[PDB]
Design a protein around this ligand. Structure first.
Ligand SMILES: *C(=C)C1=C(C)[C@@H](Cc2[nH]c(/C=C3N=C(/C=C4\NC(=O)[C@H](C)[C@H]4[C@@H](*)C)C(C)=C\3CCC(=O)O)c(CCC(=O)O)c2C)NC1=O
Ligand SMILES: *C(=C)C1=C(C)[C@@H](Cc2[nH]c(/C=C3N=C(/C=C4\NC(=O)[C@H](C)[C@H]4[C@@H](*)C)C(C)=C\3CCC(=O)O)c(CCC(=O)O)c2C)NC1=O
Ligand SMILES: *C(=C)C1=C(C)[C@@H](Cc2[nH]c(/C=C3N=C(/C=C4\NC(=O)[C@H](C)[C@H]4[C@@H](*)C)C(C)=C\3CCC(=O)O)c(CCC(=O)O)c2C)NC1=O
Ligand SMILES: *[C@@H](C)[C@H]1/C(=C/C2=NC(=C\c3[nH]c(C[C@H]4NC(=O)C(C=C)=C4C)c(C)c3CCC(=O)O)/C(CCC(=O)O)=C2C)NC(=O)[C@@H]1C
Ligand SMILES: *[C@@H](C)[C@H]1/C(=C/C2=NC(=C\c3[nH]c(C[C@H]4NC(=O)C(C=C)=C4C)c(C)c3CCC(=O)O)/C(CCC(=O)O)=C2C)NC(=O)[C@@H]1C
Ligand SMILES: *[C@@H](C)[C@H]1/C(=C/C2=NC(=C\c3[nH]c(C[C@H]4NC(=O)C(C=C)=C4C)c(C)c3CCC(=O)O)/C(CCC(=O)O)=C2C)NC(=O)[C@@H]1C
Ligand SMILES: *[C@H](C)[C@H]1/C(=C/C2=NC(=C\c3[nH]c(C[C@H]4NC(=O)C(C=C)=C4C)c(C)c3CCC(=O)O)/C(CCC(=O)O)=C2C)NC(=O)[C@@H]1C
Ligand SMILES: *[C@H](C)[C@H]1/C(=C/C2=NC(=C\c3[nH]c(C[C@H]4NC(=O)C(C=C)=C4C)c(C)c3CCC(=O)O)/C(CCC(=O)O)=C2C)NC(=O)[C@@H]1C
Ligand SMILES: *[C@H](C)[C@H]1/C(=C/C2=NC(=C\c3[nH]c(C[C@H]4NC(=O)C(C=C)=C4C)c(C)c3CCC(=O)O)/C(CCC(=O)O)=C2C)NC(=O)[C@@H]1C
Ligand SMILES: *[C@H](C)[C@H]1/C(=C/C2=NC(=C\c3[nH]c(C[C@H]4NC(=O)C(C=C)=C4C)c(C)c3CCC(=O)O)/C(CCC(=O)O)=C2C)NC(=O)[C@@H]1C
Ligand SMILES: *[C@H](C)[C@H]1/C(=C/C2=NC(=C\c3[nH]c(C[C@H]4NC(=O)C(C=C)=C4C)c(C)c3CCC(=O)O)/C(CCC(=O)O)=C2C)NC(=O)[C@@H]1C
Ligand SMILES: *[C@H](C)[C@H]1/C(=C/C2=NC(=C\c3[nH]c(C[C@H]4NC(=O)C(C=C)=C4C)c(C)c3CCC(=O)O)/C(CCC(=O)O)=C2C)NC(=O)[C@@H]1C
Ligand SMILES: *[C@H](C)[C@H]1/C(=C/C2=NC(=C\c3[nH]c(C[C@H]4NC(=O)C(C=C)=C4C)c(C)c3CCC(=O)O)/C(CCC(=O)O)=C2C)NC(=O)[C@@H]1C
Ligand SMILES: *[C@H](C)[C@H]1/C(=C/C2=NC(=C\c3[nH]c(C[C@H]4NC(=O)C(C=C)=C4C)c(C)c3CCC(=O)O)/C(CCC(=O)O)=C2C)NC(=O)[C@@H]1C
Lengths: 164, 177, 177, 164, 177, 164
């Protein structure tokens, strides 16, 4: 699960080394930055249903064709799977804010996504519309502090770029 | 590998749950006490050569048959392997302490080790005694109560870190028994 | 791998026998009906993406726990692996149909697979249901009785080819149960 | 067992590919050519004893030294093993005509032959004399059609070249 | 691998003992009789092709089912493998005789061989008969009592060398039964 | 265990070869040289305690600091381990004289020695002082014949160079 800790430990292990100063110094960065990301994670945890509804709504408002026969949102059960998928990504963003790295997105959300969405004929731009809507809907300092926004937005761009 | 944070994430994910305030107080403390954790890891790595040397010598002086012919430490090649294993084990326990999670130790060091020692004829009981001695040394260093050396720290309570590293050392015996 | 022809050769060789007229009428029919075999393989490969997609989605909509946390299809990585396995299996069944012999499927796909699925925790019962759905799809395509798509053929009886491909799909379940 | 089918299947598998048009088109060649080779195979199956007797006889007529003390045909049991070996090759030629490829010769007759014949001090030219005699004894259209002869002769040259 | 000398060293080392006069008379004889050992190894390597050929042919003429279809010597590929195995075994027995110790044979040839033959379906009983024939040939050559060929030696007693090579051949059967 | 025999056998095995003339000829060297080395081995076996006492004494006479608190000979049990180690090397030299190669030193005395002596803070020069003392104490023909001395001295230099 990529994070500050796991990156430095993996690198030391690959070299047969004990932890040393740059490893400990890297981890001091955790101690400084954790407040901003854990603020974003808590805001997310506390309000994900409303966030996910707005994001899924924006997807379908942008792409009404999705609701046509044979398209990815042709019926209610498929529509609900779409909002569920937005909820999964938001939960993984919460996980990345907690871990302080992209590990939970990389492992549980991005790896194999291309193959899945292509095979199941789910258009990537619809996912990107959801995540981008959320990134641009973010309101600082209304919703959270500036640095909590930066952390939150970084993971949303990371996912967008991963899908693009 | 997981660390303390990704451990919580794994547990939450099993329930499809977000990590929110209630679950976050423990990780908030983990962070608030983070300098102590860095100091504890520093006190081990800074004395790692002496630890391994003293622990493996201690195993032998308690069980001197280990260096008789047919003993598993007999010959330089065997003594060098054993010392190497002592340091490897310490290195992985030191990763577990820095990460606040045993998974790097279990996954990369402990898995396969009993079978291997069984296959080679490395005595798992003497192995456990070397590991118990490093445990004793590690707790001493983390609490700055080593008899032969002191290091420099702002005064405070590191009981939990000492307990935690002891649990990692205790994992090695469990895996190899 | 063997094909229909080399299968007969293997059986004859076991008896140190030449292959002569009596044994050759079956292979003569195999050849006389060869265009049908090519058409049957064409009707599968031309719809292979839709087959795999629909079969694995069908497995899941029947057993939605597969996509709960801890389900074997949960996460994109697992869903992608499963879809990949669905296509691999179809690809090897399609080789068996083109060759008129199961050996390529048994030797290169089925051998080792039960142990592997057991080791990974891939549920062999859900695997069998995905495979049964592809069986249903394959028979439909070969007999041009698919509900959502027709292809182009000179009219004739392809019952035997449909039966034969079904026997190859039925091999996969047998190997993994 | 090398044939039209196994070559194209192996190649597609090595690439992770479904069968595609050139694979099916290759196999159409089976449907065209099978009549000529299956004619040769049936003629062979029906008359192998006479063929093998003529071929083994020609070997020993060409190489009378084989019957001297310490040579490969020094007694009757060794002589009979020689005609048996000619019969094995002819049976494998029948198998190649049926399969439409060299697989049965390659696998069961050629692979390891050099080592065996050298170790057991069996002269290769005696084998070649048998097979070449059969190739040149072939009589078209007396024995079979021109294209059945071409198929039959191709496998006999293939074996000769394999031994040379 | 060990040789006759390092064998004694291994045994002494087990007791932390120096090798001195008492233990050295055997190795002194080993050396004094060393030219005989060289001649014995020469008489085998100089006839090795004929030995293998005759032994494997002898296995077959005694058990002609080996070359029936389904027999383990059937096809050139199988016959070539068997002949290859015959020569490998002889080569390792010839190393053991040159070294005056079985360890090269046991470690590099015999270990793993039973399992392998079991896995492949190579008949271990026929294998033993081929090996017994090479034993008979080897003893004959070392004592210059082969019926079809004599070699050149200063006259003397090579009973011990013949006994010793027979013990190495007898190791192969023991390992594969 | 490296020796004349094992070197030539290993090389033939690596090539898939039967023993051949240069292999047998190499081993004739055993038959010529064994007398000189077995003389040295017997002299050693018969007098190792006296040899080892002189060598360990010379180590500590050269390096009195070894007996200071925290050094490698700080107490009697550690001192006795030092003479024991000299005895082990001498026993391995006896083994090399018997085998006719460095195998027993390489395998049981040299391999891993650097790591062990560095980790346990045992100074290499103290070992070298012991072994060199023995090499230079050797007295020919008082102690053994000239060629037995050459064999004995070769293994002592080999060990010195291995530690340097
Ligand atoms: C053989 C005669 C023999 C030993 C060798 C020794 C092994 C041993 N060591 C301990 C305890 C410790 N060793 C420590 C190591 C060091 N302290 C230092 O200052 C340097 C840097 C380093 C290496 C010398 C430490 C810190 C301890 C903890 C206790 C302490 O500080 O005094 C034990 C006790 C093990 C236990 O409690 O189970 C043993 C057995 N003892 C021998 O008998
Ligand atoms: C979940 C709600 C769910 C499904 C998903 C679905 C799975 C399923 N599918 C079949 C049968 C077929 N699927 C076919 C696939 C295709 N036909 C096409 O035209 C395109 C090219 C392609 C992909 C869409 C075909 C040909 C069949 C055969 C029957 C038919 O033609 O109608 C089944 C039935 C399986 C069986 O018989 O055992 C199932 C379960 N069903 C779901 O409930
Ligand atoms: C099948 C009809 C059949 C055989 C083939 C044969 C196998 C066989 N061979 C022996 C004994 C020996 N073979 C030897 C080989 C050679 N001697 C030579 O001069 C050349 C160089 C070389 C190869 C031809 C030798 C030396 C012997 C030892 C006896 C002897 O010298 O005469 C046996 C006897 C095995 C035994 O004693 O258990 C067998 C079965 N016999 C066949 O029936
Ligand atoms: C138990 C392990 C110890 C102990 C540890 C404490 N350390 C405390 C403060 C502290 N320590 C460091 C060093 C650490 N931080 C780093 O960034 C690096 C290297 C990159 C290391 C090794 C720092 C920076 C601090 C913060 C205070 C400061 O600026 O100096 C501490 C005080 C409480 C706290 O800050 O949490 C304790 C108790 N103390 C002990 O007595 C035992 C022996
Ligand atoms: C069951 C599978 C089908 C069916 C198949 C039939 N195909 C028949 C004739 C035929 N098909 C092809 C195409 C095939 N040959 C090729 O070479 C290639 C690609 C390289 C392919 C895909 C050909 C050439 C022919 C021969 C007739 C022609 O020239 O068009 C056929 C008629 C009987 C026969 O020839 O055996 C049948 C029954 N028919 C069906 O109705 C189901 C759906
Ligand atoms: C049983 C194996 C034989 C037998 C062997 C004897 N060889 C004797 C002497 C001898 N042989 C050689 C050749 C050997 N030494 C080599 O260096 C090489 C190749 C590098 C080989 C093959 C030599 C040099 C000698 C020494 C005498 C000489 O100079 O010719 C021998 C005599 C007793 C002894 O020297 O130990 C025997 C008995 N003799 C037999 O009759 C059986 C068949
Ligand atoms: C929303 C922007 C889309 C949309 C989405 C649909 N997704 C469908 C299925 C599905 N989604 C995923 C990814 C999701 N599952 C996970 O486990 C994780 C991470 C933990 C994520 C992000 C998977 C793997 C699957 C397949 C398995 C399943 O059915 O749940 C889906 C059903 C597809 C179908 O049945 O054909 C839809 C409709 N729908 C939309 O309109 C836009 C494009
Ligand atoms: C920002 C520069 C604007 C501004 C934006 C408004 N946002 C409004 C409501 C709102 N926003 C969100 C998503 C947001 N809440 C979260 O908890 C997180 C992430 C953790 C995000 C991105 C939601 C769910 C809602 C509705 C619930 C609520 O009111 O909080 C809003 C209200 C009216 C509207 O719906 O458009 C506005 C106007 N407001 C500003 O003053 C600055 C200029
Ligand atoms: C020392 C306290 C023991 C002891 C240890 C020995 N270990 C020997 C070999 C060995 N150990 C391992 C496992 C080690 N290697 C790894 O990479 C990792 C983790 C990633 C670990 C824990 C392996 C794989 C091996 C074999 C390869 C090698 O030799 O390095 C060993 C040599 C055994 C022999 O002589 O055959 C010894 C002596 N022995 C003891 O008596 C104390 C209890
Ligand atoms: C889909 C219908 C299943 C399902 C499938 C999964 N398979 C997973 C991994 C996997 N599968 C194989 C065998 C496959 N690879 C081959 O090369 C061939 C034939 C030549 C076949 C049939 C392997 C070796 C592996 C491991 C390597 C890899 O991951 O690709 C898998 C991932 C397991 C995991 O998460 O650890 C899944 C989910 N799972 C299901 O629930 C339905 C029933
Ligand atoms: C005829 C042109 C030769 C001749 C041949 C002899 N062959 C002898 C043995 C033999 N032949 C083969 C190859 C054969 N066996 C197979 O399984 C197959 C393919 C399926 C073929 C083509 C093998 C493997 C063997 C060895 C096993 C056995 O004895 O059957 C043979 C006996 C040799 C001996 O005992 O020394 C002879 C004499 N003889 C001739 O005069 C010409 C050269
Ligand atoms: C051909 C251009 C000549 C010709 C040749 C003759 N062949 C004679 C008999 C014959 N040929 C074979 C081998 C042949 N029969 C087969 O079944 C196969 C392969 C499947 C082959 C290669 C045999 C076994 C026999 C004897 C039995 C029989 O008569 O069929 C033949 C008879 C006299 C003789 O033995 O020399 C001749 C003259 N005949 C021609 O008219 C053209 C010019
Ligand atoms: C001959 C007297 C036997 C017999 C022998 C067969 N052995 C076959 C294959 C084989 N043998 C080995 C072991 C061999 N290779 C080594 O590298 C060494 C020592 C270092 C030895 C002793 C291996 C690993 C293999 C498999 C690889 C290969 O084929 O070379 C074999 C082929 C078996 C098959 O057809 O599948 C045969 C026939 N068979 C007999 O009937 C007599 C008793
Ligand atoms: C040599 C050129 C000198 C010479 C040297 C002396 N050596 C004396 C005694 C002695 N030497 C050894 C070690 C030696 N003995 C062995 O068995 C081996 C190896 C196998 C070696 C290297 C020992 C243990 C001893 C004491 C027991 C004994 O006397 O043999 C010696 C006696 C007086 C002294 O201790 O210094 C001398 C003078 N003597 C010469 O005449 C030439 C010039």
């Amino acid at each position: 699960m990529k994070s500050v800790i796991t990156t430095v430990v993996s690198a030391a292990d690959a070299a047969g080394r004990f932890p040393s100063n740059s490893d400990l110094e890297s981890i001091q960065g955790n101690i400084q930055r954790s407040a901003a990301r854990l603020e974003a994670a808590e805001k997310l945890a506390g309000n994900h249903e409303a966030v996910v509804k707005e994001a899924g709504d924006a997807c379908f408002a942008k792409y009404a064709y999705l609701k046509n026969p044979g398209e990815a949102g042709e019926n209610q059960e498929k529509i609900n799977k779409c909002y569920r998928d937005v909820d999964h990504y938001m939960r993984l963003v919460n996980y990345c804010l907690v871990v302080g790295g992209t590990g939970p997105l990389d492992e549980w959300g991005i790896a194999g996504a291309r193959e899945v969405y292509r095979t199941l004929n789910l258009p990537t731009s619809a996912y990107v519309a959801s995540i981008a809507y959320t990134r641009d809907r973010l309101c600082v300092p209304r919703d959270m502090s500036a640095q909590a926004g930066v952390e939150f937005s970084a993971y949303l761009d990371y996912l967008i770029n991963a899908l693009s | 590998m997981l660390d303390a944070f990704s451990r919580v994430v794994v547990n939450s994910d099993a329930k499809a749950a977000y990590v929110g305030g209630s679950d976050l107080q423990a990780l908030k403390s983990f962070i608030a006490d983070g300098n102590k954790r860095l100091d504890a890891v520093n006190s081990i790595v800074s004395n790692a050569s002496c630890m391994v040397s003293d622990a493996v010598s201690g195993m032998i002086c308690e069980n001197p048959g280990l260096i008789s012919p047919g003993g598993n430490c007999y010959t330089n090649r065997r003594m060098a392997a054993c010392l190497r294993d002592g340091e490897i084990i310490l290195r992985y326990v030191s990763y577990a302490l820095l990460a606040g999670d045993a998974s790097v130790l279990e996954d990369r060091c402990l898995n396969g080790l009993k079978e291997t020692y069984i296959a080679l004829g490395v005595p798992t009981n003497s192995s456990i005694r070397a590991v118990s001695i490093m445990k004793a040394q590690a707790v001493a260093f983390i609490t700055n109560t080593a008899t032969e050396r002191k290091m420099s720290f702002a005064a405070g309570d590191c009981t939990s870190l000492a307990s935690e590293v002891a649990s990692y050392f205790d994992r090695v015996g469990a895996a190899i028994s």
